[PDB]
Each structure stands twice: as structure tokens, then as C-alpha cells.
Amino acid sequence: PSVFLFPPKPKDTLMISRTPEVTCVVVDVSHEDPEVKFNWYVDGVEVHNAKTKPREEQYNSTYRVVSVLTVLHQDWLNGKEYKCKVSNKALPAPIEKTISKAKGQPREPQVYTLPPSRDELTKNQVSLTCLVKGFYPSDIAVEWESNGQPENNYKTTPPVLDSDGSFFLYSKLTVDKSRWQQGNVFSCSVMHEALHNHYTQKSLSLS
Amino acid sequence: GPSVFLFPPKPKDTLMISRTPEVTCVVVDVSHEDPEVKFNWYVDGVEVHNAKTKPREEQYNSTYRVVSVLTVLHQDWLNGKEYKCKVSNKALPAPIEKTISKAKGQPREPQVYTLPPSRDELTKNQVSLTCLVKGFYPSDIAVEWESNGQPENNYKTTPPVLDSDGSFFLYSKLTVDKSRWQQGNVFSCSVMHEALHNHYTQKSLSLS
Numbered sequence: 001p002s003v004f005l006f007p008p009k010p011k012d013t014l015m016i017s018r019t020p021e022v023t024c025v026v027v028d029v030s031h032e033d034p035e036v037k038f039n040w041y042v043d044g045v046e047v048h049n050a051k052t053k054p055r056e057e058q059y060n061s062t063y064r065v066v067s068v069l070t071v072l073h074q075d076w077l078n079g080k081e082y083k084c085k086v087s088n089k090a091l092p093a094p095i096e097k098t099i100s101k102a103k104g105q106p107r108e109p110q111v112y113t114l115p116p117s118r119d120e121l122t123k124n125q126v127s128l129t130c131l132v133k134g135f136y137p138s139d140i141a142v143e144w145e146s147n148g149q150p151e152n153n154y155k156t157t158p159p160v161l162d163s164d165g166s167f168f169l170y171s172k173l174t175v176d177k178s179r180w181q182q183g184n185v186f187s188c189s190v191m192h193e194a195l196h197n198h199y200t201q202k203s204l205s206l207s
Numbered sequence: 208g209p210s211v212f213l214f215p216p217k218p219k220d221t222l223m224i225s226r227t228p229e230v231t232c233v234v235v236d237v238s239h240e241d242p243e244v245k246f247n248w249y250v251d252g253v254e255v256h257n258a259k260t261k262p263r264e265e266q267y268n269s270t271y272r273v274v275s276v277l278t279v280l281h282q283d284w285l286n287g288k289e290y291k292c293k294v295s296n297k298a299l300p301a302p303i304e305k306t307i308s309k310a311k312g313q314p315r316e317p318q319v320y321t322l323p324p325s326r327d328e329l330t331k332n333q334v335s336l337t338c339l340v341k342g343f344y345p346s347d348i349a350v351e352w353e354s355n356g357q358p359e360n361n362y363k364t365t366p367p368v369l370d371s372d373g374s375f376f377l378y379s380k381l382t383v384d385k386s387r388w389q390q391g392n393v394f395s396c397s398v399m400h401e402a403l404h405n406h407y408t409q410k411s412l413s414l415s
């Protein structure tokens with residue numbers, strides 16, 4: 001019997017219209033001892049909002065029990081602590097797990113778009129690059145668009161700790177060479193708490 | 208009870224015959240009651256006898272740690288042989304077996320591209336030189352930067368990322384003083400991977 005606690009998605013905390021949530025997952029619940037119990041706290045003050053999702057019977061004859069707590073955007077971004085407490089018959093003592101946003105002064109990301117290398121122009125597809133550096137903490141969302149429509153053939157690296165204590169990442173969008181050569185505009189969109197309106201975009205085109 | 212961890216060789220050690228690649232079997236949580244541990248090693252299921260076992264080390268939590276190292280042949284690892292470490296201890300009901308090998312699949316040659324700093328970044332005192340490596344399989348790779356034949360210090364590389372075609376990509380970022388870039392120095396990104404000729408390639412970047 002083990003307990004894991006998961007933070008909300010960055011995009012959910014940065015847009016007021018979306019619903020962020022903390023997730024508490026209990027694994028390795030035996031058939032002999034069901035009836036896992038959940039206690040949730042926020043800065044020590046107990047809350048009663050959580051919902052217990054239906055459990056799954058797994059392939060190795062165990063169960064996974066999930067509890068979800070909805071959180072306010074300003075609570076999470078202010079640094080409040082969330083504690084999940086799990087009690088089962090098989091456990092000797094209740095298990096406590098805690099999570100919160102990383103502490104420290106937030107730092108604004110710098111966004112740079114880089115066109116394909118000239119050597120890549122011999123291929124059928126080319127890579128468009130979006131470098132995002134200098135940001136803190138590491139919670140961030142990156143998306144690509146063109147003509148106001150989302151592009152989907154992109155992949156983003158995990159954040160990497162840089163030598164000055166900030167984070168950086170790269171996002172790579174793959175497009176057909178003919179779309180690049182015709183002059184279409186491609187945009188890298190970045191969402192982070194230290195940005196004005198939590199959002200900025202940078203464009204790239206051959207022109 | 209004891210736990211067993213098996214570690215692969217470092218990518219640079221398998222790619223240069225002058226270096227020595229090694230597989231490491233590490234056993235933790237050996238009790239003070241039953242400290243005797245036995246190792247058996249197999250390569251493709253055939254037992255080998257040239258492994259080197261270090262003396263047990265007492266930890267501050269009243270347990271022992273034991274390490275056994277097997278030196279491997281470069282061609283054996285690159286040909287996909289499987290290495291098994293088996294650990295026997297009287298506190299166990301059965302021996303513990305762990306297996307490791309190179310990732311399965313056909314190797315694919317990396318494409319290496321260097322990208323100069325963005326124009327918007329030239330207002331800064333430091334600039335970023337970018338090395339993109341894409342299309343490679345498997346993900347075991349080594350990336351380094353140098354200038355004028357001497358290694359550069361201030362770079363960081365992302366972990367490999369699985370792309371949409373089943374191959375991997377990564378980026379490496381070198382941070383340099385703007386003055387060094389604007390004076391026409393040559394910077395070079397070097398890459399080591401099994402699918403490259405001589406396991407090595409290099410690509411340069413300069414103002415010009």
C-alpha cells in the first residue's frame with residue numbers, strides 16, 4: 001500500500017475559466033483489506049470537498065483508489081500546502097503526503113523562435129524551434145498555432161535546470177517544407193504565471 | 208529484504224574501443240543477520256566467471272551494500288546481448304534475477320543541425336547557440352561542445368524525447384558572451400552515436 005500525490009496541470013492554474021485539481025492515488029490495495037479512507041487538509045485546515053473516483057481492478061489482482069480535490073487558482077499560486085491522509089487496515093499508521101507550488105520569486109520567460117537550419121532545406125519536412133529560457137518556477141505550457149488554428153505535430157522537451165537556477169526548454173514543430181517556403185506564419189504560445197495576462201506569443205515566417 | 212539494481216554502461220564507454228564499458232549489479236538492504244551474498248552472471252543465458260565483486264560496505268542504517276561489476280565487450284553490447292545478474296542470500300525465499308541489454312529496434316542515424324542566436328537575443332550580454340539532434344535510435348547518445356579545439360563549459364542538454372516517428376530528438380544549448388560570438392569565433396557541436404560513421408560527427412557554427 002503506497003500513496004502518491006499529484007499537482008494540477010499548469011494550464012488549469014493559469015486560466016480562471018479552467019478547473020485545477022490535486023490528485024491522491026493509493027496503489028496496492030489488497031482484496032482482504034478494502035475501505036481506504038481519505039482526509040484532506042489545506043494549510044492544516046481540514047476540507048470536505050474531495051471526490052473518490054471508482055476503483056480499478058488491475059492485472060496483478062490489486063486495486064487503485066483515487067481521490068480528487070478541486071483547488072482555487074489563487075490558493076495554489078500563493079503557496080498553500082495540500083495534505084492527503086490515507087488510512088487502511090493493513091497499514092500500521094496513517095500515511096501523510098504533502099504538496100505545494102515551488103517556493104521562490106517567479107521569473108519571466110524569454111521566448112525566441114529559430115528558423116530551420118539551411119542544411120535541413122534538402123529534406124521534405126523542416127523543424128521550427130521555440131526556445132523558452134530564464135523562467136521560474138518550472139510550471140509552464142507551450143503550444144503552436146498557424147493562422148489562428150492549432151498545429152499538432154509538435155513535441156516539447158521537459159524543463160531543464162539552467163546554470164543560473166532558472167529553467168529552459170525547447171519545443172519543435174515539424175511542417176512540410178512547402179508550407180514554410182510559401183510564407184505561412186507560425187506562432188509559439190507560452191503560458192506562465194510571471195507573464196502579463198499569463199500569456200505571450202512569438203511568430204516565425206520566411207517572409 | 209534485499210533489493211537488486213542493475214545499471215548499464217555509459218554511452219561513451221561503449222562507443223570508443225579505448226574506453227572500458229561495465230555493467231553494475233548493486234544489492235542493498237542486506238541484513239546484519241545474513242550478510243553472505245552470492246552472484247551469478249550470465250550473457251545470453253551462458254554463465255560467465257570474470258566478474259569482480261567488491262567487499263561489502265556497512266551503511267549507517269545497519270544494512271550492507273554489495274557491488275559486483277562485469278566488464279563487457281563493445282561489440283557484444285552493440286549486438287544486443289542480454290546480461291543477467293542473479294543474487295542469492297539466505298534471507299530470501301528465492302534468488303533475485305535482473306536482466307539488462309541495449310534497447311531493441313533498428314538503429315537510425317542522427318541528423319545534426321546548429322542554429323545561431325535569435326536576433327531578439329542580441330540585445331543581451333549572453334547569447335544561446337543551439338544544437339538540434341533528431342532522428343536517432345536508440346536514445347543512447349553523448350553530446351559535447353568545443354571552440355578552437357578546447358572544450359566549452361557552459362552548456363546543458365535536454366533528455367532525449369520520443370518523436371512522432373518512433374525516433375528520438377534532443378537539443379543542447381551553449382551559452383556564450385556576446386563579444387565572443389560577434390568576433391567570429393567558431394563553435395562546434397560534437398555527437399557520438401552508434402549509427403554514425405566512426406561513431407562521431409561534428410558541426411560548426413560561427414558568424415562569418
Ligand SMILES: *[C@@H]1O[C@H](CO[C@H]2O[C@@H](C)[C@@H](O)[C@@H](O)[C@@H]2O)[C@@H](O[C@@H]2O[C@H](CO)[C@@H](O[C@@H]3O[C@H](CO[C@H]4O[C@H](CO)[C@@H](O)[C@H](O)[C@@H]4O[C@@H]4O[C@H](CO)[C@@H](O[C@@H]5O[C@H](CO)[C@H](O)[C@H](O)[C@H]5O)[C@H](O)[C@H]4NC(C)=O)[C@@H](O)[C@H](O[C@H]4O[C@H](CO)[C@@H](O)[C@H](O[C@@H]5O[C@H](CO)[C@@H](O)[C@H](O)[C@H]5NC(C)=O)[C@@H]4O)[C@@H]3O)[C@H](O)[C@H]2NC(C)=O)[C@H](O)[C@H]1NC(C)=O
Pocket residue numbers: 004006007008009020021022023027028058059060062064
Ligand atoms: C501491480 O499493479 C499496480 C498497478 O498496475 C500497474 O502496474 C504498473 C507496473 C504498470 O505495468 C501498469 O501496466 C499497471 O496498470 C502497480 O502499481 C504501480 O506502482 C508503481 C510503483 O510501485 C507506480 O509507478 C509510479 O508512478 C508514479 C506516477 O504515476 C503516474 O504516471 C504513470 C506513468 O509514469 C501513469 O501510468 C500513472 O497512471 C500515473 O498517472 C499520473 O497521475 C495522475 C493520474 O493519472 C495524473 O494527474 C492528474 O491528471 C488529470 C488528467 O488525467 C488532471 O490533469 C489532474 O489535474 C492531474 O492531477 C498525472 O498526470 C499522471 N501522469 C502521467 C504522466 O500520466 C511515479 O511518480 C513513480 O516514480 C517514482 O520514482 C522514484 C523512484 O521510486 C520515487 O522516489 C518518486 O517518488 C517521489 O519523487 C519526488 C520527486 O519530486 C520526491 O519529491 C518524493 O519525495 C518521492 N516520494 C517517494 C515516496 O519516493 C516517484 O514517485 C512510480 O514510477 C505505478 O504508477 C503504479 N500503477 C499505477 C497504475 O498507478 C504495482 O506496482 C503492481 N505490482 C504489485 C506487486 O502490486
Ligand SMILES: *[C@@H]1O[C@H](CO[C@@H]2O[C@@H](C)[C@@H](O)[C@@H](O)[C@@H]2O)[C@@H](O[C@@H]2O[C@H](CO)[C@@H](O[C@@H]3O[C@H](CO[C@H]4O[C@H](CO)[C@@H](O)[C@H](O)[C@@H]4O[C@@H]4O[C@H](CO)[C@@H](O)[C@H](O)[C@H]4NC(C)=O)[C@@H](O)[C@H](O[C@H]4O[C@H](CO)[C@@H](O)[C@H](O)[C@@H]4O)[C@@H]3O)[C@H](O)[C@H]2NC(C)=O)[C@H](O)[C@H]1NC(C)=O
Pocket residue numbers: 210212214231233235236266267268270272
Ligand atoms: C539504507 O541506506 C542505503 C544507503 O543510502 C545512504 O544512506 C541513507 C540514510 C541516505 O542518506 C542516502 O542518501 C545514502 O546514500 C539505502 O540505499 C539506497 O536504496 C535505494 C532503494 O531503497 C536506492 O534507490 C535506487 O536508486 C537507483 C539509482 O541509484 C543511482 O543513483 C543514486 C543517486 O540518485 C546513487 O546514490 C546510487 O549509488 C546509484 O548510482 C549509480 O551507480 C551506478 C553503479 O555504481 C553508476 O553506474 C551510476 O552512474 C550511478 N548513478 C548516479 C546518478 O550516480 C534508482 O534507479 C532506483 O529507482 C529505480 O527503481 C525504482 C523502484 O525501487 C523505480 O521506482 C524507479 O523508477 C527506478 O526504475 C532506486 O530508487 C539507492 O540507490 C540506494 N543508495 C545507494 C547509495 O546505493 C537503503 O535504501 C537504506 N535502507 C533503509 C531500510 O533505510
